[PDB]
Amino acid sequence: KLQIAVGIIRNENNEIFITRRAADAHMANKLEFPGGKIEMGETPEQAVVRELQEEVGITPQHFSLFEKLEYEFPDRHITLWFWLVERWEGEPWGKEGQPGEWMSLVGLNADDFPPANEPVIAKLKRL
Ligand SMILES: Nc1nc2c([nH]c(=O)n2[C@H]2C[C@H](O)[C@@H](COP(=O)(O)O)O2)c(=O)[nH]1
Numbered sequence: 196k197l198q199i200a201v202g203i204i205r206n207e208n209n210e211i212f213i214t215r216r217a218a219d220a221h222m223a224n225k226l227e228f229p230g231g232k233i234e235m236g237e238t239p240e241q242a243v244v245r246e247l248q249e250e251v252g253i254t255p256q257h258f259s260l261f262e263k264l265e266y267e268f269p270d271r272h273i274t275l276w277f278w279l280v281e282r283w284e285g286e287p288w289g290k291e292g293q294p295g296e297w298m299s300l301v302g303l304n305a306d307d308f309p310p311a312n313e314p315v316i317a318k319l320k321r322l
Pocket residue numbers: 199201220221222226227228229230231232273275309310311312
C-alpha cells in the first residue's frame with residue numbers, strides 16, 4: 196500500500212511536462228507525471244511540491260486535485276493523487292537525469308503510461 200503524489204504540469208500551450216521511468220523501475224520505461232511517495236509526517240499537498248522540486252526543479256503553486264484513484268498492480272496497491280499544476284516557479288527539466296519533455300495533451304497515448312493513469316489521461320483530454 197503506497198500513497199503517491201504526482202503533478203500534471205501544463206503550460207499555456209496545452210502541453211504537459213512528461214518524464215520517462217527507468218528501465219529497472221516498477222512500470223519500467225513508462226511515461227509518467229513527475230511524482231513520488233507521500234512520506235510519513237507529510238501531507239499530499241506538501242508531497243507533490245517536494246516531489247516536483249526534487250524531480251524537475253519547479254515549485255507548484257495554486258494547484259488543485261485533478262483526480263484521486265486507487266489501482267491494484269500485480270504486486271502492489273497504490274493510491275494516486277493527481278494534482279493539476281498550471282502555475283509554478285522554475286523551468287521543468289530532467290533534474291534527476293531522467294528524460295523529460297513537453298507533450299501536447301491531445302497527443303497523449305494512455306498506453307504509454309501506467310494503466311492506473313487511464314482515466315486521468317482521458318479526463319485531461321477535456322480540461
Ligand atoms: N511518478 C509517477 N508514478 C506513477 C504514475 N502512475 C503510476 O501508476 N505510478 C506508480 C508507479 C510506481 O509504482 C509508483 C511511484 O513510486 P516511485 O516513486 O517509487 O517510482 O506509482 C505517474 O503518473 N507518476
